[PDB]
């Protein structure tokens with residue numbers, strides 16, 4: 001247990017993301033920061049906002065250096081605008097180091113911050129290629145590795161339903177997982193891009209061309225709540241999940257995330273819903289492994305009734321393995337060896353468990369990738 005002080009350093013609210021404490025500036029200003037492997041900017045709320053309990057006050061930080069350049073980050077669901085600068089940054093429940101990092105001071109935003117989420121900023125852990133304004137703005141993790149001896153790796157244990165978890169920086173904590181860690185290559189260093197080679201619903205192959213699973217990319221994203229699937233894959237997966245859960249019928253809108261279904265406290269029939277398996281490309285020629293998720297992961301909780309939302313949704317920008325997928329596992333972002341590791345999380349029911357299994361023989365896996 002050498003990484004013991006980093007265990008349980010994450011907090012959150014169901015479907016509102018996981019956040020870590022980060023200390024910025026001099027004297028110290030500690031804020032709650034969203035852990036986001038799907039973006040590459042370190043950015044903090046820097047002006048009052050109704051959804052913010054606290055914000056970064058640059059005038060109070062003697063070490064703050066204004067880069068005198070604006071930054072704008074737009075997404076489909078929201079956006080933010082701010083000012084670029086650099087300041088001293090430490091993670092009190094993270095590595096024992098202090099770095100000078102790029103920081104975007106968010107002055108205006110639209111549908112970005114979440115009311116009651118308890119976080120005031122975002123830590124983009126992906127690579128420089130997708131940083132804004134461009135790839136010359138060094139991401140936080142790159143600054144960390146360049147300025148210190150911290151090994152070029154981090155790992156995440158996101159615990160599902162108030163939520164908690166651990167972000168281990170510079171290593172792997174063996175108390176956070178059971179069984180073996182199975183690695184999939186990082187195809188390209190921009191998002192944490194991976195290759196899905198096969199999909200099963202209750203052991204039944206979806207039988208789609210594997211190029212469709214990765215069209216136009218498949219990413220591992222701690223900042224996205226859902227498992228997001230390309231339209232054609234989503235349609236086939238829903239059709240298969242509906243057929244496997246036919247002991248009870250649900251309205252069409254439930255599968256589209258438009259309708260919620262609620263059950264009396266402790267009566268959710270988890271047993272009627274299928275398990276879902278995603279096969280990932282392994283580290284050896286023709287070898288793959290699979291990660292299996294339970295309905296406890298893909299039906300997320302939103303009194304006497306437990307309300308759930310179907311947390312598999314459609315995408316037009318590739319597959320997104322969000323918190324739905326990550327919650328069943330201990331996930332290792334091995335940047336040094338360009339690979340992502342999965343193991344069963346130390347954080348299910350009496351009949352089934354999330355699993356990481358292999359090896360399997362899968363031929364022509366290279367044909368599954370989009371070019």
Ligand SMILES: C[C@@H](CN)Oc1cccc(CN2CCC3(CC2)C(NC2CCCCC2)=NC(=O)N3c2cccc(F)c2)c1
Nearest residue numbers: 015016017036038075076077078079111112223224225317
């Ligand atoms: C925790 C999550 C719960 N919905 O809320 C947030 C809020 C802010 C940021 C993030 C991280 N994160 C920011 C980026 C994200 C996902 C979540 C996105 N990513 C795409 C990029 C292209 C490839 C596929 C993935 N598209 C969106 O519209 N997003 C978004 C979602 C919600 C709000 C938003 F402003 C942007 C998540």
